[PDB]
Design a protein around this nucleic acid. Structure first.
Ligand SMILES: Nc1nc2[nH]c(N)nc2c(=O)[nH]1
Ligand SMILES: [Ca+2]
Length: 314
DNA sequence: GGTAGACCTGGACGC
DNA sequence: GCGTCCAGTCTACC
C-alpha cells in the first residue's frame, strides 16, 4: 500500500491533477521516444522518473494529467511542484495550435498527425541532455536507456527507492570529470563514448568556464548555441541539434539522422540539390535540416518530433 | 574541402 | 545456433 510505486487507484489522496487533454500530451508517445531516456512505465499507463530532483509517477485520463511525488509524510504535490511538471512539459505551448499550422502547410503531416496527437517536446536540463545524447550516437534507444541508467546509478545522487528500484539524480559535471570515470564507464558498457563523457565534462569545467557556459546558451541564438556545443568531444552537428532543441529552447533545431532521412525520401521524395553528395554527408544533412525548417517554420524541431516519434512506432 | 572507414555493444534477421 | 546489420563522430587523405 504505502510501499512500491503508486498507481492512481491504489493511493487516491496522494495524486493531484493538471488540466491537460490527451490531445495536448500523450505520455506513451513522449516518454519512451528518445527525448528523455529516464522514464519507465513501471505499472501499466503509469510512468515514473526523476523530474526536478525528485521522483514522480505520472498517468493520464482523457482530460487530466495525474501526478504524484516521492520526496516527510507522504502527501499530494503542491501547486508549486505541479508547476515544475507543467514547465517540464512546456504546457503553455498549445500543441493544437502547432499541429493546425503544420498540417495546413504540409498535407503529409496532417495525415500522420491525425493518429499521433499529443507529441510535444520536453524542456530538459542541459547537463542531462548533453551527456544523454553524447551516449546516443551510433546507438539504439534500448541500449542508450541502459547506458544512461548505469551512468546515473554509479555517479548520480541517490534519491529514493521504490520496490527494488533506486532512483538517482543525473550526475554533476564535477562527478563526470572525476579521475578514472572513463574506465568505470567502460565497465558499464558505454563503449568508446565513455571517453567522450569524461573528456566533455573536463572540457566544460576546465576549458569553457563551467556550468554557466552551458546554461548561458539558452539566451544565445540557435546558431551560436549549436556552434558552441560542437566544440565538445563526441558532439557533432546532430547531437548538438538534439541538445539545442530539447534543452536550450531552440524550437527550430532539426536533428538529422537515419530516421529523418528515411522520412524525407519516403514521404516527401526529397533529394539534396545544393549539396555535392546524393546520400547522407555533412553537406546533405545540413541541407535536409534547412528543408524541414523551410517546410514547417520556427517550430520545425517540434514537428520533427511528431514524425520521428511516429517513425519509431512504425 | 568533401569523402571512406573504423568504432563499443547487443538485439535482429538471414541462412 | 552464428556472421553480418544497424541503431553519429572523428580522422586520416585525395
Ligand atoms: N531526429 C532525432 N534523432 C534523435 N535521436 C535521439 N536519440 N532522439 C532523437 C530525436 O528526438 N530526434
Ligand atoms: Ca548507422
Amino acid at each position: 500500500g504505502s510501499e512500491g510505486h503508486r498507481t492512481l487507484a491504489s493511493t487516491p489522496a496522494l495524486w493531484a491533477s493538471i488540466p491537460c487533454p490527451r490531445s495536448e500530451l500523450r505520455l506513451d508517445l513522449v516518454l519512451p521516444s528518445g527525448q528523455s531516456f529516464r522514464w519507465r512505465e513501471q505499472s501499466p499507463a503509469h510512468w515514473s522518473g526523476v523530474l526536478a530532483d525528485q521522483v514522480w509517477t505520472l498517468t493520464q485520463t482523457e482530460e487530466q494529467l495525474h501526478c504524484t511525488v516521492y520526496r516527510s509524510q507522504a502527501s499530494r504535490p503542491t501547486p508549486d511542484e505541479l508547476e515544475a511538471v507543467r514547465k517540464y512539459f512546456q504546457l503553455d505551448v498549445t500543441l493544437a495550435q502547432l499541429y493546425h499550422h503544420w498540417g495546413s502547410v504540409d498535407s503529409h503531416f496532417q495525415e500522420v498527425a491525425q493518429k499521433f496527437q499529443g507529441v510535444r517536446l520536453l524542456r530538459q536540463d542541459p547537463i542531462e541532455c548533453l551527456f544523454s545524447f553524447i551516449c546516443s550516437s551510433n546507438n539504439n534507444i534500448a541500449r542508450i536507456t541502459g547506458m544512461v541508467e548505469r551512468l546515473c546509478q554509479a555517479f548520480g545522487p541517490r534519491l529514493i527507492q521504490l520496490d527494488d528500484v533506486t532512483y538517482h539524480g543525473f550526475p554533476s559535471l564535477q562527478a563526470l570529470a572525476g579521475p578514472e570515470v572513463e574506465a568505470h564507464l567502460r565497465k558499464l558498457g558505454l563503449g568508446y563514448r565513455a571517453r567522450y563523457v569524461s573528456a566533455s565534462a573536463r572540457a566544460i569545467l576546465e576549458e569553457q568556464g563551467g556550468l554557466a557556459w552551458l546554461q548561458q546558451l539558452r539566451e544565445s541564438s540557435y546558431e551560436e548555441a549549436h556552434k558552441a556545443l560542437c566544440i565538445l568531444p563526441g558532439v557533432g552537428t546532430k547531437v548538438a541539434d538534439c541538445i539545442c532543441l530539447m534543452a536550450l529552447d531552440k524550437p527550430q533545431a532539426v536533428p538529422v539522422e537515419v530516421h529523418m532521412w528515411h522520412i524525407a525520401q519516403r514521404d516527401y521524395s526529397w533529394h539534396p540539390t545544393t549539396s555535392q553528395a546524393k546520400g547522407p554527408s555533412p553537406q546533405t544533412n545540413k541541407e535536409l535540416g534547412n528543408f524541414f525548417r523551410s517546410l514547417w517554420g520556427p517550430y520545425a524541431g517540434w514537428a520533427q518530433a511528431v514524425l520521428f516519434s511516429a517513425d519509431l512506432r512504425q
